[PDB]
Amino acid sequence: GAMGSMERASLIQKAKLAEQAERYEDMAAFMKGAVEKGEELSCEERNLLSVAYKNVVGGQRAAWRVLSSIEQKSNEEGSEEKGPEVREYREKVETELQGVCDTVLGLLDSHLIKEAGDAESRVFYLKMKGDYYRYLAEVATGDDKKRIIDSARSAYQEAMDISKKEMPPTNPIRLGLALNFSVFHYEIANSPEEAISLAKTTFDEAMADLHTLSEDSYKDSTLIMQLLRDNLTLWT
């Protein structure tokens, strides 16, 4: 694409600069360019990819929720007719969000996942695949909603199966995967009991493994454990 002429190392350097500058659209474009060089990504580079797109889609999702709320209020009884503008603009933001998700999913399918052999990398990418199908699910209303939901579930499940086999229960990627799959169950799959069970089991198995960790690894794992606890507190 437009990054085709730039060195891989320069793209990664600029992604880091864009992060410092809070220029996440630019950061995502740089990381897309880096992925399209065709080499596997290192651990740090995978994190840059994830941070970039999470910030971009996070903005779009927040905007979509504002607009959907306004649209829902407009369609109540006693609400004055205000024409097609709210729906149009919600649709515009929605389409842009879907585009970002399709871009990320495209990078994963061509060809990050198939080249990812180590557990850390493969679980990371499958979690991403789950997450971006989940964002598509949040705005889906048509013939394909069920299939989108199943695509998320399938990716998360493959990631879970590998993580349980190949990573310790305190591994931050394993933890973040479980956290997000638990949210999928609660928010998307209408399975709050599954969400709660998953969060609880994940928290308890991690707790039991903390004794094996260095101070720095303990900090990484307990940060994510607190998010599991926060959700359990919200849900029970």
């Binding site: 999470k54 949210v183 609660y186 998010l227 926060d230 959700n231």
Partner: peptide
């Protein structure tokens, strides 16, 4: 809302 990981 429910917390998910990376955090934007």
């Amino acid at each position: 809302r429910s917390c998910t990981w990376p955090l934007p």
